[PDB]
Design a protein around this ligand. Structure first.
Ligand code: XMP
Ligand code: XMP
Lengths: 643, 658
């Protein structure tokens, strides 16, 4: 009703995105959708696409609605009207055709391989040509248009113009499907669902949660929205306070629960009884404890608020909510805590089973949430923040009592010494060099020759466990460190960072260590747990790196940047027998679309060397810091986080 | 040592590998080197030409990586792409505009050597960075996009720059451009073919191996087979010892047709019939495991199979009295590693010999002594097949889809008990509402409100249409299957869907994506062929890795694959697991008939890399009628209740069901 239906035979998502970017509402339907169903719903126009015969209602062409056939859609269109078939380019277009007004006679388009029109359907006219291949057809009086190319991609340079001609000129869509209007529709639906009931929101301090809170407050009375922040003791420096301050500025008050002590001393049942969080080393155990503790506290706090419990809603900032979550997913990463089953969480269980859990942001994409936040009056600084994980800094401290050394340790280090000193090592061949040779490509070997002669590198295992993905599985295994005598050549390090995990599948990460060469890598660890002093050190480190990044103008160039503390104290004379007391900081830059794959930022490339070095300079000053390191690993085998 | 060869200096990490691929497709040898490689090294190595690339970044950046400007002056032809052109212009005293990336139609100077054979107008991928103001002296502008300089040339020193990427397909005639540079300009002859690479590879095998024997463990897969043929072609008949251990989990007569094809080419294969050894195989738990033919757990299946294989392999080397000190082991692996991950062994494809096993001393020694070689390491997947043909292997043999080490063992869902957790009834109620959405919406209750609250407006709309046009049932099946959610593997429910009417495939595929988004306790969604399933089973047919169960699946797998092959669409799918499930449908619940029949799943899969992928949609990548023939045919096999079609993509699914 003012909208446009997309029927795909395979592109639907892409057309959906382009139509949305042009401020028209776009629902995708299955190809078999009948025309009466489309007429009943009041769609203004129909878009039909598909790759290089499935059941469709030919009435989609006959019911008097404008139709755009892209590719297969164009073929269907032609076939339905009698036409036949036989058997990136600069094509010719007839800019008098409604679809093509305001284009040049010549257009760059993405043409896909497959069938091509022979007899052009009666009442239709050819309106685009690529050599002889018919690239466009049109019946103006029936407002049916076929294009062989895909205007919905960016590789078709003026595809946005074509789509505009279809939606506005031909179909008469007015361009009112904006974030502003969707926000107002969203407010109306919130008013309608909630009525006079109170709404509790569990505000974590992240972007989605804050916009959700601001949206709920905008939709409802001031007295109807209760924002509750449970501080788990693992949040960054000053960023709890500034979220409260921003929401306060908008007339929204936030109830803060200072629950740090209950998280630090958190303990739970394991799939047996866990250690307290402040004595745990296991990342899986950290997540369960924190997950289980948060929910117990949330459930209690809801209890304490003396609300009529059949007039309470619980609202979340989740963009992709689920009915049932898996505990497997809770154990390993991001997950909806309130959607999994727990003990001592009756109130939450009741809200869930009563249909009182709402996700107002479910109809918005991630970029839209930001625009939504600006519109609701939140500062741009706040809405542009990088994601920050629920368990916060807890998964950013590598905790250990003992060094991580398995029986493969000595061999792997021998392999690594060869890799780092490859050009020299080739001049004194031994058994293990031959194994390296037998497992690496001629091209890789040759590139290794150059790299290791142009620079003096050391490579070695660090006695710590980090998470990584090997095939379908998460795995905990070694970090490999590289240091150099002179300034680092970044691209060469990136290369080693890919090469080493390929050679040694027991290596999950390759990092670069800043400063002088590491002649004697530690074989011991600084004892490290989630204690208030350790968290204090990391908070200051994380703060400095993030401020430096932000002040530099480059914060938007990276998706995320975990800053990690490791139990490693470097540069002790081994014949001095001095104990391991200091810790070391990793900078883990990450660039990604979807967080399934991604790359570090290469300094000199997406981020300036100077910015990175300034981080190193500043963090070194923090008391208790041995070395700074830079994570060079891609995902896979890396992951964004270190645990 | 590199005459006839070209060197690629990549300032970044992106374009080096693409240029390398393109150059190799042009039959020229290509080496990727660091940007900072000195001119004299390039000179002494013998390279015929240099290609330099990198991205939009400024060469005037305080960051700009170091390079040896004498690379431009050693007298070898140079093609600079984007960053490379920017470097080139800077070196020879040009400048960039003070002020400040799609696909444009640009103009090109026909007479410049780089552009011979092209029309003046050309479509290219133009990058977005710095643009040439003062063109370096001795250079002429040879390509233009509006006012922007897009190409430069110095013909006398054979130096060419382009502001676009001819190495990408989206530069329509980028191949012609690279051809002009490698052939017309640099004078490469195009000797770097699979044929000549094979001859070089043979020379290298003779050299490393001498008169020593080479053992190869022939798995039956393409890589293993090509490797075996390769080694035979390089050495004597007496030198190559090919051993095929039959693990009992192979497909119908494909460890015969691989022995036969190799014998016909003069290659003898010692076959070890070890099926029974695997069936009753056992291993330590990561305590003794159960026997393979009594195991339900896929981790145990893999470890048992993996451990047994290496133990027998070691046993065979022993009985031949082959000393590791005078013998080699060869693997068909494309991407070998020195050290294998112990996790990967237990969960999927891995090099079994590059991990420590107990009681495998001869294999350990072969690895430790550097006697494991990988002939195929310098070839890509597409080249392996070409190589196999050139070695005289049959097209049907080099063309086979991958088939996992543990074979059919991970394609039988083994069970004694139904898989049922506390979430079972709740999940079934959710699925009932999903399947019956438009009718459920007409009579709304609390659970419906939970469904609307977790679904997008769009998905609800799409779901309204679907569930009014067809009458569908949806329900959990009481079995476990592997799935990947985010970073992690999971073992959880399969959801089933049946319909009164003919299946609408795109609707089912939508449902297949929706249901796992709503219910993260669900790893897969299948379509069950035939009449509606009114009363889903809550019991399972007890099922283990036993000879009769294997006989049945082997037959189902055979039929499915034959139909696929004889219809011509075999090459359109990447892999087709056929899976046996412990499920007996259509028993009248008010009668207490025991579960004794089983059901077959067709799992079509399409992928580039096996990290993500999709099922084939019947009527899309594969004809409906071909799928329906598998259904008709497989149903005839004794003991088979229903046929199912896997609708799940990866993620949340995986290729295999275990
Ligand atoms: O809320 C969260 N709870 C968690 O336990 C968790 N673990 C990882 N992450 C975030 O998810 C994204 C992917 O992280 P990985 O690449 O390490 O899997 C990145 O954005 C990570 O920060 C989490 N978020
Ligand atoms: O040699 C193997 N041993 C195994 O244990 C194994 N498990 C999966 N596969 C194959 O690997 C690819 C990925 O499948 P998944 O999506 O199930 O991980 C698919 O091609 C699978 O056939 C295996 N191969």
């Amino acid at each position: 009703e003012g909208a446009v239906v997309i029927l795909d035979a395979g592109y639907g998502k892409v057309i959906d995105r382009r139509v949305r970017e042009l401020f028209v509402q776009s629902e995708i339907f299955p190809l078999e959708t009948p025309a009466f169903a489309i007429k009943e719903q009041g769609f203004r126009a129909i878009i039909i696409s598909g790759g290089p015969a499935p059941w469709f209602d030919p009435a989609i062409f006959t019911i008097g609605k404008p139709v755009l056939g892209i590719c297969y859609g164009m073929q269907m269109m032609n076939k339905v009207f009698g036409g036949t078939v036989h058997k990136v380019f600069n094509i010719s277009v007839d800019n008098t055709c409604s679809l093509f007004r305001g284009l040049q006679k010549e257009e760059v388009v993405l043409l896909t391989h497959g069938d091509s029109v022979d007899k052009v359907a009666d009442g239709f006219k050819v309106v685009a040509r690529s050599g002889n291949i018919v690239a466009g057809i049109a019946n103006e009086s029936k407002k049916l248009y076929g294009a062989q190319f895909h205007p919905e991609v960016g590789l078709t340079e003026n595809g946005k113009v074509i789509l505009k001609n279809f939606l506005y000129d031909i179909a008469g869509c007015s361009g009112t499907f904006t974030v502003q209007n969707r926000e107002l529709e969203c407010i109306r639906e919130i008013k309608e669902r909630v009525g006079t009931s109170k709404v509790l929101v569990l505000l974590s301090g992240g972007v989605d949660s804050t916009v959700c809170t601001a949206l709920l407050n905008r939709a409802l009375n001031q007295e109807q929205v209760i924002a509750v922040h449970i501080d788990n003791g693992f949040m960054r420096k000053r960023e709890s306070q500034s979220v409260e301050e921003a929401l306060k500025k908008l007339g929204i008050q936030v109830k803060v629960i200072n629950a740090a002590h209950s998280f630090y001393n958190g303990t739970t049942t394991l799939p047996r009884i866990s250690k307290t969080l402040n004595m745990t080393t296991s990342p899986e155990e950290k997540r369960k404890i924190i997950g289980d503790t948060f929910v117990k506290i949330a459930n209690e706090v809801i209890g304490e608020m003396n609300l009529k419990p059949e007039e309470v809603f619980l609202a979340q900032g989740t963009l992709r909510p689920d009915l049932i979550e898996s505990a497997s997913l809770v154990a390993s990463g991001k997950a909806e805590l309130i959607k999994t089953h727990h003990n001592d969480t009756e109130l939450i269980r009741k809200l869930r089973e009563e249909g009182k859990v709402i996700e107002p942001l479910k109809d918005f994409h991630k970029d839209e949430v930001r625009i939504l936040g600006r519109e609701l009056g939140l500062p741009e600084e706040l809405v542009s923040r990088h994601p920050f994980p629920g368990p916060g800094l807890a998964i950013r401290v590598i905790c250990a009592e003992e060094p991580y050394i398995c029986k493969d340790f000595p061999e792997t280090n021998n392999i690594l010494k060869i890799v780092a000193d490859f050009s020299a090592s080739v001049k004194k061949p031994h058994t293990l060099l031959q194994r390296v040779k037998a497992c690496t490509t001629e091209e890789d070997q040759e590139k290794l020759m150059q790299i290791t002669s142009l620079h003096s590198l050391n490579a070695f295992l660090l006695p710590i466990k980090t998470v990584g993905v090997q095939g379908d599985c998460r795995s905990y295994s070694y970090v490999c460190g590289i240091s150099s005598k002179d300034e680092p050549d970044w691209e060469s390090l990136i290369f080693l960072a890919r090469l080493i995990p390929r050679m040694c599948h027991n290596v999950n990460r390759v990092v670069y260590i800043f400063g002088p060469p590491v002649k004697e890598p530690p074989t011991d660890v600084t004892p490290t747990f989630l204690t208030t002093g350790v968290l204090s050190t990391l908070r200051q480190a994380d703060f400095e790196a993030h401020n430096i990044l932000r002040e530099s103008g480059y914060a938007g160039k990276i998706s995320q940047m975990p800053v990690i503390l490791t139990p490693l104290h470097f540069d002790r004379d081994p014949l001095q027998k001095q104990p391991s007391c200091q810790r070391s900081v990793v900078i883990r830059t990450f660039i990604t679309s979807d967080f399934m794959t991604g790359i570090p930022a290469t300094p000199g490339n997406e981020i300036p060397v100077e910015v990175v070095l300034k981080m190193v300079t500043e963090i070194k000053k923090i008391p208790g810091i041995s070395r700074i390191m830079y994570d060079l690993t891609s995902k896979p085998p890396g992951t964004t986080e270190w645990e």
